[PDB]
CSV table of C-alpha atoms and ligand atoms in Angstrom, one decimal:
chain,number,residue,atom,x,y,z
T,1,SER,CA,0.0,0.0,0.0
T,2,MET,CA,0.9,3.7,-0.4
T,3,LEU,CA,1.3,4.2,3.3
T,4,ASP,CA,3.2,1.0,4.0
T,5,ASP,CA,5.5,1.8,1.0
T,6,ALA,CA,6.2,5.4,2.4
T,7,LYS,CA,7.0,4.0,5.9
T,8,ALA,CA,9.3,1.3,4.5
T,9,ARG,CA,11.2,4.0,2.5
T,10,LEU,CA,11.4,6.4,5.5
T,11,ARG,CA,12.8,3.7,7.8
T,12,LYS,CA,15.8,3.3,5.6
T,13,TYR,CA,16.9,6.9,6.4
T,14,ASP,CA,16.2,6.8,10.2
T,15,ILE,CA,19.2,7.9,12.2
T,16,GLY,CA,17.4,7.1,15.4
T,17,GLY,CA,18.9,8.6,18.6
T,18,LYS,CA,22.5,8.6,17.3
T,19,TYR,CA,22.9,12.4,17.7
T,20,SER,CA,20.3,13.0,20.4
T,21,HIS,CA,22.5,13.2,23.6
T,22,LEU,CA,25.0,15.8,22.2
T,23,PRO,CA,25.1,18.9,24.3
T,24,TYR,CA,23.3,21.4,22.0
T,25,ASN,CA,20.4,23.8,22.4
T,26,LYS,CA,17.8,21.3,21.2
T,27,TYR,CA,14.7,21.8,19.0
T,28,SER,CA,12.5,19.2,17.2
T,29,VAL,CA,10.2,19.6,14.2
T,30,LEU,CA,7.5,17.3,13.0
T,31,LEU,CA,7.2,16.7,9.2
T,32,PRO,CA,3.5,15.7,9.1
T,33,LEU,CA,2.4,13.5,6.2
T,34,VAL,CA,-1.3,13.5,5.4
T,35,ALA,CA,-2.9,11.2,2.8
T,36,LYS,CA,-5.7,13.0,0.8
T,37,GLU,CA,-7.2,12.3,-2.6
T,38,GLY,CA,-5.0,9.3,-3.0
T,39,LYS,CA,-1.7,11.4,-2.7
T,40,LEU,CA,0.6,12.2,0.2
T,41,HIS,CA,0.8,15.8,1.4
T,42,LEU,CA,2.9,17.7,3.9
T,43,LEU,CA,1.3,19.9,6.5
T,44,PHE,CA,2.8,23.3,7.1
T,45,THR,CA,2.1,26.2,9.5
T,46,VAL,CA,2.4,29.9,9.0
T,47,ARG,CA,3.8,31.5,12.1
T,48,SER,CA,1.8,34.2,13.8
T,49,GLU,CA,2.8,37.8,13.0
T,50,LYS,CA,3.1,38.6,16.8
T,51,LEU,CA,6.0,36.0,17.3
T,52,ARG,CA,9.4,37.7,17.7
T,53,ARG,CA,11.3,35.1,15.8
T,54,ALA,CA,10.3,34.7,12.1
T,55,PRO,CA,6.7,36.2,12.1
T,56,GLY,CA,4.6,35.2,9.2
T,57,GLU,CA,7.0,32.5,7.8
T,58,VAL,CA,6.1,29.0,6.7
T,59,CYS,CA,7.4,26.5,9.2
T,60,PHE,CA,6.8,22.9,10.2
T,61,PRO,CA,5.3,22.4,13.7
T,62,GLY,CA,7.9,22.1,16.5
T,63,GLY,CA,9.9,23.9,19.1
T,64,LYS,CA,12.5,23.8,21.9
T,65,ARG,CA,12.9,20.7,24.0
T,66,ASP,CA,11.9,21.1,27.6
T,67,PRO,CA,12.5,19.0,30.7
T,68,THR,CA,9.3,17.1,30.5
T,69,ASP,CA,10.2,15.5,27.1
T,70,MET,CA,11.2,11.8,27.3
T,71,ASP,CA,13.1,12.2,24.1
T,72,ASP,CA,13.4,14.4,20.9
T,73,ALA,CA,10.3,12.9,19.3
T,74,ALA,CA,8.3,13.9,22.4
T,75,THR,CA,9.3,17.5,21.8
T,76,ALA,CA,8.0,17.4,18.3
T,77,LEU,CA,4.7,15.9,19.4
T,78,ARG,CA,4.2,18.3,22.4
T,79,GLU,CA,4.8,21.3,20.2
T,80,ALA,CA,2.6,20.0,17.4
T,81,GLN,CA,-0.3,19.5,19.9
T,82,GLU,CA,0.2,23.1,21.3
T,83,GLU,CA,0.4,24.6,17.8
T,84,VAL,CA,-2.3,22.8,15.7
T,85,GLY,CA,-4.1,20.4,18.2
T,86,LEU,CA,-2.6,17.2,16.9
T,87,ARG,CA,-3.0,14.6,19.7
T,88,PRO,CA,-0.6,11.7,20.1
T,89,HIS,CA,-3.0,9.0,19.1
T,90,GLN,CA,-3.3,10.9,15.8
T,91,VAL,CA,0.3,10.6,14.8
T,92,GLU,CA,2.7,7.7,14.1
T,93,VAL,CA,6.3,8.8,14.3
T,94,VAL,CA,8.1,6.8,11.6
T,95,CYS,CA,11.6,8.1,11.8
T,96,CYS,CA,14.1,10.6,12.7
T,97,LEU,CA,15.9,12.3,9.7
T,98,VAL,CA,19.3,13.9,9.6
T,99,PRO,CA,19.5,16.8,12.1
T,100,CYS,CA,20.1,20.4,11.1
T,101,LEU,CA,23.0,22.3,12.7
T,102,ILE,CA,22.6,26.0,13.1
T,103,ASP,CA,24.3,29.0,14.9
T,104,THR,CA,27.2,26.8,16.2
T,105,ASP,CA,25.2,25.8,19.3
T,106,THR,CA,21.8,24.4,18.1
T,107,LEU,CA,20.7,21.1,16.7
T,108,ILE,CA,17.2,20.7,15.2
T,109,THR,CA,16.0,17.1,14.9
T,110,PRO,CA,13.2,16.4,12.3
T,111,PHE,CA,10.8,13.5,12.7
T,112,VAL,CA,8.4,12.3,10.0
T,113,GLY,CA,5.0,11.5,11.3
T,114,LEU,CA,2.0,9.9,9.5
T,115,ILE,CA,-1.2,11.8,10.4
T,116,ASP,CA,-4.5,10.2,11.0
T,117,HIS,CA,-7.2,10.8,8.3
T,118,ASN,CA,-9.7,12.2,10.9
T,119,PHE,CA,-7.3,14.9,12.2
T,120,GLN,CA,-8.5,18.4,11.6
T,121,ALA,CA,-6.1,21.2,12.5
T,122,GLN,CA,-7.2,23.6,15.1
T,123,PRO,CA,-4.6,26.5,14.6
T,124,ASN,CA,-3.7,28.1,17.9
T,125,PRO,CA,-3.8,31.8,16.9
T,126,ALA,CA,-1.2,32.9,19.5
T,127,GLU,CA,1.4,30.8,17.6
T,128,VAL,CA,-0.1,29.9,14.2
T,129,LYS,CA,-1.7,32.2,11.6
T,130,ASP,CA,-2.6,29.5,9.2
T,131,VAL,CA,-2.2,25.7,8.4
T,132,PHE,CA,-2.0,24.3,4.9
T,133,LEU,CA,-1.2,21.2,2.9
T,134,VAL,CA,1.1,20.9,0.0
T,135,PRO,CA,1.2,17.7,-2.2
T,136,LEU,CA,4.5,16.0,-1.6
T,137,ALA,CA,5.0,15.7,-5.4
T,138,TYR,CA,5.1,19.5,-5.7
T,139,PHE,CA,8.6,19.4,-4.2
T,140,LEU,CA,9.9,17.5,-7.2
T,141,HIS,CA,8.8,20.3,-9.6
T,142,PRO,CA,8.5,23.4,-7.5
T,143,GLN,CA,7.9,27.0,-8.7
T,144,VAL,CA,11.2,28.6,-7.8
T,145,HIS,CA,11.8,32.4,-7.2
T,146,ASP,CA,15.3,33.8,-6.5
T,147,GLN,CA,15.4,36.5,-3.8
T,148,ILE,CA,20.6,35.2,-3.8
T,149,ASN,CA,18.6,32.2,-2.3
T,150,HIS,CA,15.9,29.9,-3.8
T,151,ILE,CA,12.3,30.4,-2.6
T,152,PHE,CA,9.4,28.1,-3.5
T,153,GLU,CA,6.0,29.6,-4.3
T,154,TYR,CA,3.0,27.2,-3.8
T,155,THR,CA,-0.5,28.3,-4.8
T,156,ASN,CA,-3.4,26.4,-3.2
T,157,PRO,CA,-5.8,25.6,-6.0
T,158,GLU,CA,-8.7,25.5,-3.5
T,159,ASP,CA,-8.5,29.3,-2.9
T,160,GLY,CA,-5.6,30.8,-5.0
T,161,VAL,CA,-3.5,31.8,-2.0
T,162,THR,CA,0.2,31.7,-2.6
T,163,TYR,CA,2.7,30.7,0.2
T,164,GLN,CA,6.4,31.1,0.2
T,165,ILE,CA,8.4,28.2,1.5
T,166,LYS,CA,12.2,28.6,2.1
T,167,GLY,CA,15.2,27.7,4.0
T,168,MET,CA,15.4,24.6,6.3
T,169,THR,CA,11.6,24.1,5.8
T,170,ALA,CA,12.0,23.9,2.0
T,171,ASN,CA,15.1,21.8,2.3
T,172,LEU,CA,13.4,19.2,4.5
T,173,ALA,CA,10.3,19.1,2.3
T,174,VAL,CA,12.4,18.2,-0.8
T,175,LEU,CA,14.3,15.5,1.2
T,176,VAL,CA,11.0,13.8,2.3
T,177,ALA,CA,9.7,14.0,-1.3
T,178,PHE,CA,12.9,12.4,-2.7
T,179,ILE,CA,12.8,9.6,-0.1
T,180,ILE,CA,9.2,8.7,-0.6
T,181,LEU,CA,8.7,9.4,-4.3
T,182,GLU,CA,11.9,8.4,-6.1
T,183,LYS,CA,12.0,5.4,-8.3
T,184,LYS,CA,8.3,4.5,-8.3
T,185,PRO,CA,6.4,2.6,-11.1
T,186,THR,CA,3.2,4.5,-12.2
K,1,LIG,C1,11.9,27.0,10.9
K,1,LIG,O1,13.0,26.6,11.6
K,1,LIG,C2,12.7,26.1,12.9
K,1,LIG,C3,13.7,26.1,13.9
K,1,LIG,C4,13.4,25.6,15.1
K,1,LIG,C5,12.1,25.1,15.4
K,1,LIG,C6,11.1,25.1,14.4
K,1,LIG,C7,9.7,24.6,14.7
K,1,LIG,C8,8.8,25.7,15.2
K,1,LIG,O2,9.1,26.5,16.0
K,1,LIG,N1,7.6,25.7,14.6
K,1,LIG,C9,6.5,26.5,14.9
K,1,LIG,C10,5.5,26.7,14.0
K,1,LIG,C11,4.4,27.5,14.3
K,1,LIG,C12,4.4,28.2,15.5
K,1,LIG,C13,5.4,28.0,16.4
K,1,LIG,CL1,5.3,28.9,17.9
K,1,LIG,C14,6.4,27.2,16.2
K,1,LIG,C15,11.5,25.6,13.1
């Protein structure tokens, strides 16, 4: 099946807890995969304009580890619940992808999660201005704009709204698309 095939592919790239104890400032993100209309999608957030760090930017759910978290995956799930109402029974964490080093002292660990079909986002407006889906296949043939760094522009066909996706968030989306969609019979 589509979902069993995606999980099998993802597991081959799992690094597990290999880098998890290193003494960094630690953040986790959840890369949430949603199946709709017979295709996989990634779920993104738009950060609230009142946040001091990166207002109005497209981001995956996530945040800083705190002492309650049993592990890095728990960070991702706790933050996703706070931001978009995703409950733990609604997500299966499949793997941990290569972590992202930034600022010399920070390590961001991405987890891919399969999201239940009955989940409906409840954006928490103190943190999230918007939530939207992009088909995973978009990231194989994105609409690129050069600002010099590459920015993706995705237009939702439901409503015509265009979102800019860039940086680590864009990078991770392409990685997941490659992992799941490369070398597939039609
Ligand atoms: C983009 O690079 C990142 C670096 C460190 C963490 C994160 C995840 C995050 O913080 N997401 C998030 C989304 C919506 C609202 C709020 Cl409060 C947080 C992303």
